[PDB]
Amino acid sequence: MLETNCLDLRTKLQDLEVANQTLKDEYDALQITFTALEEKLRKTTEENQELVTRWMAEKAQEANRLNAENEKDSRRRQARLQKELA
Amino acid sequence: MLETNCLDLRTKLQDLEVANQTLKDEYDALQITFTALEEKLRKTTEENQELVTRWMAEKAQEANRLNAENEKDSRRRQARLQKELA
Amino acid sequence: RSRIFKIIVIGDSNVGKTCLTYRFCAGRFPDRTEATIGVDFRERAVEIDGERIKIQLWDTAGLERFRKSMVQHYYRNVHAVVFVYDMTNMASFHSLPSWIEECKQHLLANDIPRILVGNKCDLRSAIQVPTDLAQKFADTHSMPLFETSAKNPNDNDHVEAIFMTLAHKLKSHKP
Amino acid sequence: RSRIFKIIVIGDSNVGKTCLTYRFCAGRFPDRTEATIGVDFRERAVEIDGERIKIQLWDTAGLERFRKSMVQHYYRNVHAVVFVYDMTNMASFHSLPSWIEECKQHLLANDIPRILVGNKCDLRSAIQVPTDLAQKFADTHSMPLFETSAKNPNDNDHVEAIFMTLAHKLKSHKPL
Ligand SMILES: Nc1nc2c(ncn2[C@@H]2O[C@H](COP(=O)(O)OP(=O)(O)OP(=O)(O)O)[C@@H](O)[C@H]2O)c(=O)[nH]1
Ligand SMILES: Nc1nc2c(ncn2[C@@H]2O[C@H](COP(=O)(O)OP(=O)(O)OP(=O)(O)O)[C@@H](O)[C@H]2O)c(=O)[nH]1
Ligand SMILES: [Mg+2]
Ligand SMILES: [Mg+2]
């Protein structure tokens, strides 16, 4: 309006009191809908950690076995080298 | 206030403030804070899929090798038997 | 002279495939298990009639995501098929027709032995699958039934006796 | 009967440790790489001055979560250490002191040779680490420098010549 009256202000106030509770509806529908998505993330991160931990455990065992194997071959070889001297 | 008067509009002044501590800003806020949560979730999920796919592929290659070795040994056995029939 | 027998172990997750196969090959119960990914291979050399036999067990995965591209590999040149369920879980038992259908669709010969094994027989108070139900299923599919326990390996059908009986059956190509 | 030389390869993720070691042992560039998890082992038998020698390369992981609780295994009975950085990545060059410090805290002898390798010299238009910087670094730490390319293995310092030179020094117990 070029000059606002009480009618103008009133219907404005009703429209805003509509959009406000609409936005409250759209806010309360994200306030926990993502609080759950939080839990899904926690779960998937946990899964990821389990997988990586089991894989890394296998690699640690395999590296350990290889070091023992190398050592065994070193001792065996030096054993032959000691046998030859006699 | 058992009987409200015009000065009780100073309590609506309080509500136009306690509301805009959340009113609109926090919606656009949580929207982007948790459009970032979706991304960490989908990345953790993607990571899980890569991990499992890579593990499964290694297992498939190992099972293929072992089948081929079993086959080699089987051909040895049959060839030996054919030598024996002579 | 050492000939090999590839024997695959098939069944729902947690029925005890890893514990059974390990019990047979290592001669102990697992300290701890996790869901098998892809497959695990366990072997045991035994002697039958003076001949050396390598019993090669494939401990397959029961979870769908962990067996996804493996089934062709399971069934290639398989010498025998061992189906496994959990005696304390009726749903694991109701799964067998689908495992059997998978087997029937992937086998490349009509003369490959199959056997049926109920596991965790030590859990007497929680058993859900009575013997006669299992027995009829086994008979009508031309399979022997075994009820056994990887955890207590001498209860009912001895775990050793299952795989050794099967290996004897394969070696002599007998019924 | 053949001596084994354990040689570990250490550096940031993506500098090309897998590609270098695979290049030396397989004689090709990888069809594809993914982040190394824990460690990969690659071996190559060679003949140096009449003797057969097995070169056992430990291609380690550069990502923190993929090398967790592995370092004790990397450094047990190691015969030589190869530090690697990406010539197109200054940050990977700046990580070198922490890698050195890890080495220092885990080496059990004072006479294990260490060398320094800048990789991806073929990406000349994107190089971030000038030769003279890296050379001064390597000299002050008593390491030879090499600038190489696992992708193009005859560019600048030949990939083969790097590991072969090292293996010669180990076999002779000679200086660098
Ligand atoms: N009481 C009892 N528990 C058992 C026995 N065998 C296996 N279990 C338990 O059942 C659970 C599953 O065992 P696994 O061997 O890991 O199961 P699986 O069949 O290999 O499952 P997937 O690898 O996922 O396919 C574990 O908790 C075992 O301890 C048994 O003979 N007696
Ligand atoms: N242009 C070029 N690219 C290279 C070269 N060497 C490696 N790359 C590339 O660099 C990327 C990283 O290679 P990797 O060998 O897997 O790196 P890495 O050091 O093993 O990484 P981590 O295993 O995570 O520690 C890959 O895309 C390679 O293709 C090279 O000499 N030249
Ligand atoms: Mg299992
Ligand atoms: Mg790598």
Numbering used by the authors:
A (entry chain C), B (entry chain D): 140 to 225
C (entry chain B): 30 to 204
D (entry chain A): 30 to 205
Question: What do the paper's sentences say?
Answer:
Autophagosome formation is a fundamental process in macroautophagy/autophagy, a conserved self-eating mechanism in all eukaryotes, which requires the conjugating ATG (autophagy related) protein complex, ATG12–ATG5-ATG16L1 and lipidated MAP1LC3/LC3 (microtubule associated protein 1 light chain 3). Here, we demonstrated that RAB33B plays a key role in recruiting the ATG16L1 complex to phagophores during starvation-induced autophagy. Crystal structures of RAB33B bound to the coiled-coil domain (CCD) of ATG16L1 revealed the recognition mechanism between RAB33B and ATG16L1. ATG16L1 is a novel RAB-binding protein (RBP) that can induce RAB proteins to adopt active conformation without nucleotide exchange.
We prepared the ATG16L1(141–265) complexes with GDP-bound RAB33B(30–218) or GTP-bound RAB33BQ92L(30–218). Their crystal structures were determined at 2.4 Å. In both structures, GTP- and GDP-bound RAB33B-ATG16L1 complexes adopt the same conformation. The complex showed a dyad symmetry with a 2:2 configuration. Two molecules of ATG16L1(141–265) formed a homodimer, within which the dimeric helices of ATG16L1 formed a parallel coiled-coil structure (residues 161–194). The C-terminal segments of two helices (residues 195–225) are detached from each other, where one RAB33B molecule binds independently to each helix. Each RAB33B bound one molecule of GTP or GDP and one Mg2+ with well-defined electron density. RAB33B interacted with ATG16L1 mainly through its switch I, switch II and inter switch regions, whereas both the CCD and the C-terminal detached helices of ATG16L1 homodimer were involved in the binding with RAB33B. The core hydrophobic interaction formed by invariant, hydrophobic dyad residues of I66 and F95 in the switch regions of RAB33BA molecule (molecule A of the dimeric complex) with W194 and V191 in the CCD of ATG16L1A molecule, respectively. L205 of ATG16L1 made hydrophobic contacts with F70 and W87, two of invariant, hydrophobic triad residues of RABs (F70, W87 and Y103), which have been proposed to be important for RAB-effector interactions.
